[PDB]
Amino acid sequence: VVVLMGFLYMRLPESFVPVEDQGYMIVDIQLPPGATRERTSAAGGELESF
Amino acid sequence: MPLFFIRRPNFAWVVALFISLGGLLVIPFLPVAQYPNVAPPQITVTATYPGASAQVLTDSVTSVIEEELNGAKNLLYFESTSNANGIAEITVTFQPGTDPELAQVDVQNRLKKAEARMPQAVLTLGIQTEQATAGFLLIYSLRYKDGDKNANTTALADYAVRNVNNEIRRLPGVGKLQFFDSEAAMRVWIDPQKLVGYGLSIDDVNNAIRTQNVQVPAGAFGSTPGSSEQELTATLTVKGTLDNPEEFAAIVLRANQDGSRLTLGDVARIEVGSQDYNFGSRQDGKPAVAAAVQLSPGANAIQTAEAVKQRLTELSANFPDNVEFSVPYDTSRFVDVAIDKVIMTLIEAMVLVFLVMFLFLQNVRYTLIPSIVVPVCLLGTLTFMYLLGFSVNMMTMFGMVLAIGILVDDAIVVVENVERIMAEEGLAPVPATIKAMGQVSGAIIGITLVLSAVFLPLAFMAGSVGVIYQQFSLSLAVSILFSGFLALTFTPALCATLLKPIPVGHHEKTGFFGWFNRKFTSLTSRYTKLNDKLVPRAGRVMFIYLGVVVLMGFLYMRLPESFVPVEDQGYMIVDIQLPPGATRERTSAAGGELESFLMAREAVQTTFLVLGFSFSGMGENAAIAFPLLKDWSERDSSQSPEAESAAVNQHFANLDDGAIMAVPPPPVEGLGNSGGFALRLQDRAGLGRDALLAARDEVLGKVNGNPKFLYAMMEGLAEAPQLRLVIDREQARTLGVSFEAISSALSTAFGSSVINDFANAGRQQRVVVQAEQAERMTPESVLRLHVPNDSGSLVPLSAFVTTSWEEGPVQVARYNGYPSIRIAGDAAPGVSTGEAMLELERIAAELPEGIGYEWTGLSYQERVASGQATMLFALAITVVFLLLVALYESWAIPLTVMLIVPVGALGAVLAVTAIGLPNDVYFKVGLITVIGLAAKNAILIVEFAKDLWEDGYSLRDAAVEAARLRFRPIIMTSMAFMLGVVPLAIATGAGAASQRALGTGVLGGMLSATMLGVIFVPIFFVWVLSLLRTKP
Amino acid sequence: GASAQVLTDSVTSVIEEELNGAKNLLYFESTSNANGIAEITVTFQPGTDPELAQVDVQNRLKKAEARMPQAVLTLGIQTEQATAGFLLIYSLRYKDGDKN
Amino acid sequence: DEVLGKVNGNPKFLYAMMEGLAEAPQLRLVIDREQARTLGVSFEAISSALSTAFGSSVINDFANAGRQQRVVVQAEQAERMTPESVLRLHVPNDSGSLVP
Amino acid sequence: LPEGIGYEWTGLSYQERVASGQATMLFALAITVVFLLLVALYESWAIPL
């Protein structure tokens, strides 16, 4: 029993804190370098429509 | 309580394991040090105003800050020094125990109010406020391996700033990083005569540098708001600043339409040099770069020391190959050696006392018990020491090493009592332990309490001595508290468990222990007869005791007083002070002669010299050297720092160019630059600077001729010639010359002007413009300067400027807002400070009315401690008396036993006078410990005496029987403590002064308290109980 | 109007040099952007009271003050207690949803 | 690039990216200091013109309904959208004439 | 990586490293303290084991 405990204890994946459904998400919009604010606005418009 | 542990031994074992576990668990976080934060917290304000004389620096900058710093919370004092190099230093000292962060906070809060009034130059340079941990933990020095005479110290210092200083400053534990050099900057050495030839003024070159070497925040095209069409936002990235000297030489001063250009390089030599040239660092005759690390409060030292050394070692993988690092100055090593010495002594006494018990109990198992109980008490003491935030520092080391023997005494009496019961009544270990502990329970608790009470008042003293006694007395106090608690809980269980039955009548002994038992029964019999012959005559022996106490008083009043004994710290201070007006090169020549002599000496391992820095003050004529000596194992007493100091002072006593003086370091860091006394002579009536110097000459002449003082000097720079420039304002104005033009020309030509910043390899560094070396060495050079008029023509300064030599102060000193003269000195060998300050008060009483004096630092703390000692003694005596009457339910028995105090004081005083040590804090606390242990010895007799006197015996018979019974434990524990502390009295090496200072005093006091105490205590009991007619 | 590198070497690095040696540093991150904004986040060990950290940081910043360009100084620097994470966002809009 | 190739090509990670902005094109302005000085143009004039035209210059404060708010001067949208607009700027010389 | 290119952990990685370090001594201290309290209560060692 104790050797089993050790064997399956050594196989348990580690984690900090389980991820929780906080009710919101993050969306990053990153255009290629040199993109003017208007291109970002158009991309955000497509994103907001979807 | 004890019977419960007799019936439940494993419970006592578990409580033990709990306290021991705590002890082992708290060990790793232990902070180590030499001395605690004995010095009061200090804040320091630095201001840099280039080109300003000391006097104008005093009136225009530091006086402004001095006015505002008044009124801060918890001010003890403030001292301000203005130097001719344009540096103002203000040190504000507060009360000990104030939180440093809030003090620095208040200081900066007031500095912000100050800010509005300073000149724009110092404000562009900035004013720094820092927590002053006076004393450098270590100094790391970088040098070139080959020792080139052409060593470019500027490039090496720049590398140190870029790659080393920031890392070290980031490490945990470094409170401050003081750089003894200057980082790189862009130097522009202008030739004023070339400017005259090209019809240019100095302010013209200043404005050209300012406008042409400027970063350009251009921006980006297509920026928001951006048009709906264009999609290419991109930066414009204009090159504004200049990177290398070649680009700076291309700065255009004047250019015509045809194409001809006058450039900066045509009129000035441009290079990368040091921003500042006030300071220089040499090591063993070779130029080097050095920086000192000052520890942050509340940090481990050994861990921080090895962390800094290891950081230097890992950066060692990255130094240039010609570059090597070293640590010529390091305090931590001393700490290490010291603690090692202490811990080694801690083992020795541990074995020695063990032997002592094996000599008396004559069985290994009986000897074992206290040897197990003691380390438990030590570990608990360490745990409670951490819980109070104390440090593992030398006085605490002395604390626990003397605590060993006071601690062993409870276990000694317990085991010896159970042995005696075992021998007399033959009871089994459990009932015998029950009976013995029932006999000695009340004695043990009363003991623990009275010894705790002898030392508790020491834990309430204030000041620097207050801190010293804090740690020492509190360590001893927690040790004795745990000793009592363990005596009540652990030890009876140990006797109940570990002891073996003895067959009845086995006082027969094969071996010399038979001689010990028989000759010791004979010793107790002779002593019992001596008591028998001594009880009939009691009142007459009182006269012998009165002679004893009067002797104590007489020799106590003749003991010289001292703060802290001077310790061999392994290094010395050498001050180089040439006559006023001396150039850096003369100081360098004198330092070279000094370095040659020091390197000619075997006692010096390495010599570190600083030019421009010293105790007296900052200047070209001032320098300081820190000779480091070899390890104590490689040097004898004739090669000690004191003898080496005498030899250096003797060799150079006839120096023809300047003054040279060797001194030992002060005993306590942060309380001064050296040992001795420091007085501030104060202009309390506004007599004026000339009258101040007259009175200063008076007092210095009076003191320096007095043999009570080894020396006495102005800790500061003496007056120097000045070259006043008489400017005919009317003549200058008539020629069309503005005063601004003269001001700017003089300031930039001689005081050096910082124009703007340039990007050197990613760092913003100053660009400094100054006149060329050959064009500013002589007073004819100031007259050879030219300034522009309103019509654009250049007018020489000689047309309206005349030069006249006067005399003026190169350093100005102010104390508590009044102009002050700082006087420092050291007492002569064999002369205490107290009589010296008394004579100084007598001298100051003769000074003209309105001229004041005040003590500062070490003298202040000494005055407070000398004040507080007597009330300490009174409180201790009253508290022991009150707990004495509480325990015995009587007053007479307390008076009886308190008669034992003067004999222990007698022994301590006689020993310290015989060996000739001063009345230091070490002797003081050793006397206190002797006092407590004499009280314990007296209790050990008087408790059994009271028990037997309540049992129906006659007074004399009861006293005799109790003394006969309890002789063995007293001599037992007494000899144990003597032979346990004898290593202190004979210790040698690092810290040996404090070791011997404790050891001789405690040995003598204990010796008298034992050898005479065993005889006089029954006499006191019989005489007092007869005189007061006490009934059982 | 300052580029990322100009902000980096002219203002950002100047403050970076001075913030070194603060009590209780775990680390510090510095980001210089092309819009002219420089951000420095100094993270300490847990359990330290934030007020002593803030006064120490400003105490070093005033030492720094003497070196930045007059434009930033006229605009001023800001030091704030960063509780990373927003409690809430409140938004104002027009009811009719006008494009103008 | 080496790390992000070993890592973005490593299935142990859902994604790995530069928390930060990638390198962007810049338009360096090579200024002939000698030519500008010969035409009587100070470097201060060029710096001030460029900064105010493109980086926007905050001049002083004005009272808007009792609050002090900045007055910001910047070049018009149509006059700063292309690199040629940089070259179309003019600065004064010592004689009061304007030099492009 | 080439000699001189270093790495460090920040925030969540730092805290996770410290916790993964600390768990084992947490367990050991818990076990020793429960053992000591048990031997205290039962006046024996065998019953605690």
Say which residues have a Cβ less than 8 Å from residue E44's Cβ, sequence separation at least 6: B10
- Say if CB C10 and CB C2 are below 8 A apart: yes
Question: Token pair for residue B242?
Answer: 């200049």
Distances (CA, A) of B301 to B35, B305, B391, B392, B690: 11, 6, 10, 10, 49
| C26 inside 8 A of chain E by CB | yes
- Say if CB B184 and CB B722 are below 8 A apart: no
The two beta strands, B323-330 and B604-611, are: unpaired
Greatest pairwise CA separation for chain E in angstroms = 62
Within 8 A of A40 by CB-CB distance, chain D residues are: none
Q: Is B238–D34 a contact, with Cβ atoms under 8 angstroms apart?
A: no
Beta-bridge partners for B184: B274
Report how far residue B301's alpha carbon sits from residue B34's, in angstroms, rounded to the nearest whole number: 9
Q: Is B232–A38 a contact, with Cβ atoms under 8 angstroms apart?
A: no
Q: Is C33–D21 a contact, with Cβ atoms under 8 angstroms apart?
A: yes
Beta-bridge partners for B786: B796
Beta-bridge partners for B919: B561
**Phi (first) and psi of residue B24, to 5 degrees:** -70, -35
Report how far residue B842's alpha carbon sits from residue B822's, in angstroms, rounded to the nearest whole number: 19
Q: How far is D83 from chain A (nearest CA, A)?
A: 14
* Residue written as token pair 């006839």: B654
Report how far residue B408's alpha carbon sits from residue C61's, in angstroms, rounded to the nearest whole number: 57
| E10 inside 8 A of chain C by CB | yes
Within 8 A of C43 by CB-CB distance, chain E residues are: 10-11
**Phi (first) and psi of residue D2, to 5 degrees:** -60, -50
Q: How far is C70 from chain D (nearest CA, A)?
A: 12
Closest among B1019, B975, B971 to B520, alpha carbons compared: B971
Q: Is C13–B763 a contact, with Cβ atoms under 8 angstroms apart?
A: yes
Note the helical H segments in B463-583. Answer: 463-498, 512-534, 539-556
Question: Token pair for residue B107?
Answer: 């200081």
Q: Is A39–B231 a contact, with Cβ atoms under 8 angstroms apart?
A: yes
Within 8 A of B218 by CB-CB distance, chain C residues are: 1, 3
Within 8 A of A36 by CB-CB distance, chain B residues are: 222, 226, 230-233
Q: Look up residue D99 and give its DSSP letter.
A: E
The two beta strands, B280-283 and B286-287, are: antiparallel
SS (H, E, C) E2-48: CCCCCCCCCCHHHHHHHHHHHHHHHHHHHHHHHHHHHHHHHCCCCCC
The two beta strands, B709-714 and B720-727, are: unpaired
Q: CA torsion sign, D58 to D63 to D68 to D69?
A: negative
Report how far residue B465's alpha carbon sits from residue B574's, in angstroms, rounded to the nearest whole number: 29
Distances (CA, A) of B416 to B368, B377, B436, B1010: 13, 20, 10, 18
Question: Token pair for residue A40?
Answer: 């970002």
> What's the full length of chain A, in residues?
50
Beta-bridge partners for B281: B610
Q: Is B14–E36 a contact, with Cβ atoms under 8 angstroms apart?
A: yes
Which chains does chain C touch, 3 or more C-beta pairs < 8 A?
B, D, E
Beta-bridge partners for B818: B815
Q: Is C5–B177 a contact, with Cβ atoms under 8 angstroms apart?
A: no
Method: cryo-EM
Q: Per 3-state DSSP, what percentage of chain C is helix, strand, and coil (rounded to 5)? A: 40, 15, 45
Q: Is residue A44 classed as helix, strand or coil in its secondary structure?
A: helix
B670 phi-psi bin (left φ>0, alpha ψ -120 to 50, beta other): left
Report how far residue E37's alpha carbon sits from residue E26's, in angstroms, rounded to the nearest whole number: 17
For helices B332-360 and B955-985, angle between their N-to-C axes, nearest 10 degrees:
140
Please state, as a whole number, how many other Cβ atoms lie within 10 Å of the Cβ of residue B300.
20
Q: Is B10–E36 a contact, with Cβ atoms under 8 angstroms apart?
A: no
Question: Token pair for residue E5?
Answer: 């290119």
- Say if CB B580 and CB B719 are below 8 A apart: yes
Cβ burial, residue B257 (10 Å; 0-12/13-18/19+): exposed
> What's the full length of chain B, in residues?
1032
Beta-bridge partners for B330: B138
Q: Is residue B682 classed as helix, strand or coil in its secondary structure?
A: strand
Q: Is residue B429 classed as helix, strand or coil in its secondary structure?
A: helix
Report how far residue B595's alpha carbon sits from residue B597's, in angstroms, rounded to the nearest whole number: 5
Q: How far is B256 from chain D (nearest CA, A)?
A: 6
State the resolution, in angstroms.
Answer: 3.0
Report how far residue B408's alpha carbon sits from residue B417's, in angstroms, rounded to the nearest whole number: 14
| B215 inside 8 A of chain C by CB | yes
DSSP B756-781: EEEEETTEEEEEEEEE-GGGSSSHHH
Say which residues have a Cβ less than 8 Å from residue B809's Cβ, sequence separation at least 6: B54, B55, B689, B717, B719, B720
Report how far residue B91's alpha carbon sits from residue B255's, in angstroms, rounded to the nearest whole number: 52
Q: How many helices (H) and strands (E) does chain B have?
A: 33, 31
Among the partner residues D20, D26, D51, nearest to C1 by beta-carbon distance: D51
Within 8 A of B236 by CB-CB distance, chain D residues are: 26-27, 29, 50, 54, 86
Spatial strand order of the sheet with B174-179 comes to B174-179, B289-295, B138-144, B323-330
Closest among B457, B467, B676 to B562, alpha carbons compared: B676
Beta-bridge partners for B498: none
Within 8 A of A37 by CB-CB distance, chain B residues are: 224, 226, 233
Beta-bridge partners for B254: B262
Nearest CA in chain D to A36: D81
- Say if CB B217 and CB D51 are below 8 A apart: yes
| D54 inside 8 A of chain C by CB | yes
DSSP B587-628: HHHHHHHHHHHHHT-TTEEEEEEEES--SS--STTEEEEEEE
| C89 inside 8 A of chain B by CB | no
Say which residues have a Cβ less than 8 Å from residue B161's Cβ, sequence separation at least 6: B179, B183, B184
Say which residues have a Cβ less than 8 Å from residue B423's Cβ, sequence separation at least 6: B502, B507
Peptide bond into B50 cis (omega under 30): no
Report how far residue B85's alpha carbon sits from residue B611's, in angstroms, rounded to the nearest whole number: 14
